[PDB]
């Protein structure tokens, strides 16, 4: 078992644990490569930038799981859910839309082609041109 090496690339120390002192923290100017980041017990985990952007990438998937909690996606400009060729689903017993603004009536306003939502048998949603009555009985090829 290798317990020390120091060559032209790097230095490997085979210590059982790495234990840093000091409450002020530390600075690693290049990176940290850790397979598993775990929070301290009885302690929070926080992934923030003081003044700048945060970018995080994983080409083979991201699982955000709240095994007992919430996903409070608090933004102020855009909660972009942009899938290249996939889909979005909202698996929940109820769906709430608490702040969709009202639309005041136009008994004689200009004719604008508004759209309506039609639901396929598998929950797939698609748009439809609004008409005199309900026009969600025109095509099934989208649902097919």
């Amino acid at each position: 078992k290798l317990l020390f090496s120091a060559d032209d690339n790097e230095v490997v120390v085979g210590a059982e644990r790495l234990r840093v002192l000091g409450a002020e923290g530390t600075v690693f100017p290049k990176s940290i490569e850790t397979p598993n980041v775990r929070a301290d017990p009885f302690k929070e985990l926080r992934l923030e930038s003081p003044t700048r952007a945060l970018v995080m990438e994983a080409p083979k998937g991201v699982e955000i799981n709240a095994e007992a909690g919430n996903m409070e996606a608090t933004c102020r400009t855009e909660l972009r859910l942009e899938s290249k060729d996939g889909e979005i689903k909202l698996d929940a017993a109820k769906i709430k839309l608490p702040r969709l603004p009202h639309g005041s009536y136009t008994p004689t306003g200009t004719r604008q082609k508004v759209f309506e939502i039609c639901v396929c048998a598998n929950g797939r949603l698609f748009l439809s041109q609004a008409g005199t009555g309900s026009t969600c009985q025109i095509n099934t090829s989208v649902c097919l």
Binding site: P41, F42, E67, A68, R76, L97, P98, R99, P101, H102, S104
Partner: protein
């Protein structure tokens, strides 16, 4: 654009509901904020619903007076601010039971309300049916008061504005002047009580009371209390002249292989507005996907004794996770999570003493049963006369 919201009028026990014209106050992207003028908290008798953009409530006897309400339209700012561009302030005046019939209250509606517009004479006493429930309006939200009103609506066939929900005064749970009365489904009374009253007519007699079977029968059978969500103490016709909360977590549980550990939950672990204590609230232990501990698991937990206990093995050394679920009488669950560290025996192999014994019978049921294991450990502890059974550390069992 300054928008003048008209002043509102509310009556103690009557459901007040006002629609704020949010289209005029707020532009595209502007979101209304409703609070008290100069304060960040609305009055305790009012609740603002952004879905219909409606301020609704039920004032109690302690909410009498004029309540100023500030409505400010916050606007989106590029960096991130939310600037209250247009702030509209209107006042709501609360009147006591000395207020007139809801005909004066129903002064802002295109509907005439002829049913409500019908009244009694100045000398004719008003026949009112009052249902007494085992609930507290102070502990209940104004949303919960509207819930109670519209749940009783399904049995009373009466609109919300014509009802009167008041607290019980001086612990009076029966009316001596009532000519008709009926028991409820509650055999005991916990809260002070609530009186929900609605007019049936003017000085009505027993032979003139309308069909009240749809009120009497469900209250007696308990289905009315099932739909209301609160117990029904009773009913009488007289001629009148939450989710639990958490404060402290369990950081981690320190256990050792071959050692029996037992933890009693602290009395301040969980709180509820209706219960206030952990012991009076149902407590369960669960896994990641809400599955209970098996009978054969090395850790169990008794709800009646509110005590978790266990004894780990070296095949389960390291970390583990568990959830504490706190469910109240209201059917709502608060969740806390905790982690358990199981370590090897610190003394290890260099123990100054090593006790060895061979018994009779197969060790397969004894090893396969954690109940047999803990019984054995506590039995050795009692054999020494000891109290803390953790002082025993079994190290190895071999079939012979």
């Amino acid at each position: 654009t300054v928008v003048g919201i008209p002043d509102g009028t509310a009556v103690v026990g009557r459901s007040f509901r006002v629609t704020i014209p949010t289209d005029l106050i707020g532009s595209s992207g502007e979101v209304i904020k409703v609070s008290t003028a100069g304060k960040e908290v609305l009055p305790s008798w009012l609740h603002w619903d952004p879905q219909s953009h409606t301020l609704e409530g039920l004032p109690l006897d302690t909410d009498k007076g004029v309540h100023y309400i500030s409505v400010s339209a916050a606007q989106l700012d590029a960096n991130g601010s939310h600037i209250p561009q247009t702030s509209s302030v209107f006042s709501i005046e609360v009147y006591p039971e000395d207020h007139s019939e809801p005909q004066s209250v129903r002064a802002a509606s295109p509907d005439l309300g002829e049913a409500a517009a019908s009244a009694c004479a100045a000398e004719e006493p008003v026949t009112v049916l009052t249902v007494i429930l085992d609930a507290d309006l102070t502990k209940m939200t104004p949303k919960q008061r509207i819930d109670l009103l519209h749940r009783m609506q399904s049995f009373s066939e009466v609109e919300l504005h014509n009802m009167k929900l008041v607290p019980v005064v001086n612990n009076r749970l029966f009316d001596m002047s009532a000519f008709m009365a009926g028991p409820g489904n509650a055999k005991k009374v916990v809260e002070n009580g609530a009186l929900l009253s609605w007019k049936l007519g003017c000085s009505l007699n027993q032979n003139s009371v309308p069909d009240i079977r749809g009120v009497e029968a469900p209250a007696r059978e308990g289905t009315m209390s099932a739909q209301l969500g609160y117990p029904v103490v009773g009913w009488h016709i007289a001629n009148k002249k939450q989710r639990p909360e958490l404060k402290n977590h369990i950081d981690r549980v320190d256990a050792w292989v071959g050692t029996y550990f037992e933890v009693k939950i602290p009395s301040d672990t969980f709180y509820d507005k209706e219960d206030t204590t952990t012991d009076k609230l149902k407590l369960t232990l669960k896994l990641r996907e809400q599955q209970l501990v098996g009978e054969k698991s090395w850790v169990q937990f008794n709800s009646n004794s509110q005590l978790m206990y266990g004894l780990p093995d070296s095949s389960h050394v390291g970390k583990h996770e568990y959830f504490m679920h706190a469910t109240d009488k209201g059917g709502l669950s608060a969740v806390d999570a905790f982690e358990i560290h199981v370590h090897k025996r610190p003394q290890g192999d260099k123990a100054p003493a090593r006790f060895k014994a061979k018994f009779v019978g197969d060790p397969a049921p004894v090893v396969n049963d954690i109940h047999k294991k803990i019984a054995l450990v506590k039995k050795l502890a009692f054999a020494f006369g000891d109290r803390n059974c953790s002082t025993v550390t079994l190290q190895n069992i071999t079939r012979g």
